[PDB]
Design a protein around this nucleic acid. Structure first.
Lengths: 62, 57, 72, 138, 189, 143, 67
RNA sequence: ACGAGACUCUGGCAUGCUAACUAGUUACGCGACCGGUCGGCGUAACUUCUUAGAGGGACAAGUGGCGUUCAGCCACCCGAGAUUGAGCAAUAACAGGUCUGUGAUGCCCUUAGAUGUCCGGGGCUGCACGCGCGCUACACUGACUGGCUCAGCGUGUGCCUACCCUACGCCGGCAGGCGCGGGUAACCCGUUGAACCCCAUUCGUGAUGGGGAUCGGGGAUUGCAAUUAUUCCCCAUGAACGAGGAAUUCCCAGUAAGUGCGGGUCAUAAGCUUGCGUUGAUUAAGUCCCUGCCCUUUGUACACACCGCCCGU
């Protein structure tokens, strides 16, 4: 899969059995027309960049 | 005077400790006066609870 | 019975102790003791002896952590 | 005569008695660099090269420190020295240089002249520490 | 003009990762002469990431038994093994450490499956902050196990483990555990 | 350096199985009467170079160390630092190599068992007496 | 948590209702007037009442107040 | 209305105030070289470090974001501090513990054991055993004269009794004895000189200088006898342990951990316990997955309330 970074744009919330995954909207700085839900691990702030070697998968949402 | 005792009069229960505290406060005044004047000064007005002692300096 | 590591300045000890060791920047007693199969005490003694021979300068040493730095 | 400035960290407390001089710095019988740890030495040296040797060349401050522990005695000598320098400059020469040095010290370390409020917490029975509890079997 | 210890400079370092640069602090105003400053980093979020990377790295050095709470010993063993890496490589130790962290901070690994689920694991992105936490933890643990039951002493395992993590040698625990984490992430799609 | 003659690997004092690799005062601790502190004092008194091992030294050093060992009173070692001071029966004198007095200090234990004494019979049964409580001892490998 | 209690909220409500004219937008003046016009036995309680008084005044500055 | 909160004590800031030869900062007679170390003193700048007395200070108070455009939450210039820690803590209850605290108690002991007087000696210190708290170890982040640098809580001269902390010199490597005494205490121990950081000499992967019945002999307290001897200063050996397969205590910042000190213990007696400083953490700003507990809806033939009720042989 092509390597393309994504930056956090909104902290959706917490998921997981123990509430450790974090739903967050991430946008790719190539077209600003895609903003996908990603579950992330660990302390996540708002506005950092998440390196993404894999993007064919989506976080559960809606 | 922090002293700690066991709450229960027996051994049953969780580890519960009463922490009783008694605080003692100390004041000192030093004067240049004859004994008669100091004696007149001391017993002019007092309130129970305070202990007053006259000592030679 | 007991594991054998050389506690004497022997032929293997005298070999590659003053000519080939300075070619390697990493000069610490553990590396020496592993290279020529001796104890740590003998490696520390050997580096102390070569320091007393005026070969390589010192940086620090607390009890067994000693640093030698070359000039070439 | 002191600038009356003090400086604390943990139960330790240090004050820099201040007088007109030529920037010779002394800490309880010793100058600022012969302090024993020799690894905390950089912590003591923090101000004198944080702002330069020139600013420490027209005032003699002797830092007296009383408190517990080695490192807790540190963070008191250094903070007392820095805040004594800033108070001396503020009350004697001007504010512009004082303001400059205060900004420099705060930017490097905001807790360079403010005390660290944290103190050891009391211990509660049924446990060895403040928050640790005795082990029991279920 | 602030230099780490007395000779390490903070102008030769470069992140070139864009992923984790705000949670690594070596070139900004966080420059200091002593990797021992206590501080209030661990009392609030949005302020824990402002600790200098070397300060966090030396903070996590002490662990296990009496070794905990000996930050000065960590300063000594950090000036040591840093002299050692600088003599072994000749490069600037800070940039080598930053390279090791970039190479060792995991990008994606497994947690619980989205909304709900505990039978298996589902791959998710690792935050940069948690990834530097994991990188530091693996570095320290690999170093202390390398010292464990070994003739060689401390200030060596730190040095070699850090240099292999920077270079990618499989003898490094940090980057091998990194590749392990991404392999679990791949296997749990 | 390499010594060209008389390097020993099985050092021997008196019928003792000790290592020749061991440092001097680290191998002579095998004496059941004295060792460690007493050994260090004896060798520091006998004027031996501690910076050397137990093989890179001449025979005279070991000879004089053994002589000062077997004669503690002849060479300024007090009658408080040693373990044969006067006791039951007759006072013991001279500490000799190996279990030369350890047998002497076990035969008094034998006497204590043979006389049927409370402390003696508790020594015989395997129950320590100098102040040792018993709540978990004798639980692994007990009869 | 920093939720005001019905004691603080009720006292601040009564203070705004009865002594509106003296009360201003500054917290410190609110504290002083609350000390002067009412017997508030605790400095902390005084300060909580004064803070809610200030917030209520900002609320009236927004316009209508529901409570 | 009670509970929560409020409250009180605490932990942090006032160079603002009432002020202190039971505290120091300032007062100088070797100025030891022709601007200096002091608690080696070379024998009247007054409360700043110290001392808790009265006021003050912080309130989500300002900005921004979210939010019934509420209650509030999050982030920040600023500020000592933007959640210190405890104390108290309702309605109801439990067959929870305590008759081992007493004419504060409702029953037996009355005929020479009725304890109101007493014990010479052993008991919970000894056992085929399973368990619970914690310590000493798990290494060459450790050690083999430790050489130099500090505080914190706070206790201490007693009439039921020499029954204290002890400063200084004498006796010895040693437990301990002698004297003058300082302290009824911010007056003396005490400026409470331990834990630690150092080292241009000595440990090196043992079963051991990482270690204990280092088996047995040398010790003893102005006070009943140290007996499986709970006190003790000296002199090698050794069991055992390579992170401890199940099962899991307890942990939100001076927190865990790292150690020492002081009381209750106490005629000497701390692995216990209760407080105290002493170093400073990758970790958490979350959730109901487990364990519980609470609430709502729901069912009930239970109400002694599921340890219920009840059917049949």
């Amino acid at each position: 899969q092509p390597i393309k970074l994504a930056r956090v744009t909104k902290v959706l919330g917490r998921t997981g059995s123990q509430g450790q995954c974090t739903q967050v909207r991430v946008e790719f700085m190539d077209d600003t027309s895609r903003s996908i839900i990603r579950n992330v691990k660990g302390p996540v702030r708002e506005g950092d960049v998440l390196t993404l070697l894999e993007s064919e998968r989506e976080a559960r949402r809606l | 005077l922090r002293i700690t005792t066991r709450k229960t009069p027996c051994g049953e229960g969780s580890k519960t400790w009463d922490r009783f505290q008694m605080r003692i406060h100390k004041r000192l005044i030093d004067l240049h006066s004859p004994s008669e004047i100091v004696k007149q000064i001391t017993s002019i007005s007092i309130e129970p609870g305070v202990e007053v002692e006259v000592t030679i300096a | 019975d007991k594991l054998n590591n050389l506690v004497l300045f022997d032929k293997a000890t005298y070999d590659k102790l003053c000519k080939e060791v300075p070619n390697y920047k990493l000069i610490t007693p553990a590396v020496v003791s592993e290279r020529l199969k001796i104890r740590g005490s003998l490696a520390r003694a050997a580096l102390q002896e070569l320091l007393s021979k005026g070969l390589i300068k010192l940086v620090s040493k607390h009890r067994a952590q000693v640093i030698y730095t070359r000039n070439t | 005569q002191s600038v009356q400035v003090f400086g604390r960290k943990k139960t330790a407390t240090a004050v820099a008695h201040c007088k007109r001089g030529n920037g010779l710095i002394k800490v309880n019988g010793r100058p600022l660099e012969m302090i024993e740890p020799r690894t905390l030495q950089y912590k003591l040296l923090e101000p004198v090269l944080l702002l330069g040797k020139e600013r420490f060349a027209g005032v003699d401050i002797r830092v007296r420190v009383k408190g517990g522990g080695h490192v807790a005695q540190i963070y008191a000598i250094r903070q007392s020295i820095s805040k004594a320098l800033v108070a001396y400059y503020q009350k004697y020469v001007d504010e512009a240089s004082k303001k400059e040095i205060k900004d420099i010290l705060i930017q490097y370390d905001r807790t360079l002249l403010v005390a660290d409020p944290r103190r050891c917490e009391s211990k509660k029975f049924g446990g060895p520490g403040a928050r640790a509890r005795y082990q029991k079997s279920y | 003009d602030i230099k780490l210890f007395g000779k390490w400079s903070t102008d030769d370092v470069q992140i070139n990762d864009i992923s984790l640069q705000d949670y690594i602090a070596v070139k900004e105003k966080y420059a200091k002469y002593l990797p021992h400053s206590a501080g209030r980093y661990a009392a609030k979020r949005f302020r824990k990431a402002q600790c200098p990377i070397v300060e966090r790295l030396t903070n996590s050095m002490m662990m296990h038994g009496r070794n905990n709470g000996k930050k000065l010993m960590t300063v000594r063993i950090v000036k040591h093994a840093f002299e050692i890496i600088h003599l072994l490589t000749g490069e600037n130790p800070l940039q080598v450490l930053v390279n090791a962290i970039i190479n060792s901070g995991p990008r994606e690994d497994s947690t619980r499956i989205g909304r709900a689920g505990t039978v298996r694991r589902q791959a998710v992105d690792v935050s940069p902050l948690r990834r530097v936490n994991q990188a530091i933890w693996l570095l320290c643990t690999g170093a202390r196990e390398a010292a464990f039951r070994n003739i060689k002493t401390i200030a060596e395992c730190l040095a070699d483990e850090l240099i292999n993590a920077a270079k990618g040698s499989s003898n490094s625990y940090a980057i091998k555990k990194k590749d392990e984490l991404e392999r679990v992430a791949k296997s749990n799609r | 350096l390499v010594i060209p003659e008389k390097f020993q690997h099985i050092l021997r004092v008196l019928n003792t199985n000790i290592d020749g690799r061991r440092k001097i005062a680290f191998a002579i601790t095998a004496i059941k009467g004295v060792g460690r502190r007493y050994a260090h004092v004896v060798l520091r008194k006998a004027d031996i170079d501690l910076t050397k091992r137990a093989g890179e030294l001449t025979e005279d050093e070991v000879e004089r160390v053994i002589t000062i060992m077997q004669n503690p009173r002849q060479y300024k070692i007090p009658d408080w630092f040693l373990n044969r001071q006067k006791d039951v029966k007759d006072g013991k004198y001279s500490q000799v190599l190996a279990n030369g007095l350890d047998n002497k200090l076990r035969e008094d234990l034998e006497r204590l068992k043979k006389i049927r004494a409370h402390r003696g019979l508790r020594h015989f049964w395997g129950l320590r007496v100098r102040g040792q409580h018993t709540k978990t001892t004798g639980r692994r490998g007990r009869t | 948590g920093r939720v005001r209690t019905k004691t603080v909220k009720k006292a601040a409500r009564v203070i705004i209702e009865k002594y509106y004219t003296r009360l201003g937008n500054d917290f410190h003046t609110n504290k002083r007037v609350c000390e002067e016009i009412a017997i508030i036995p605790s400095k902390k309680l005084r300060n909580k009442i004064a803070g809610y008084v200030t917030h209520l005044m900002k609320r009236i500055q927004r316009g209508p107040v529901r409570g």
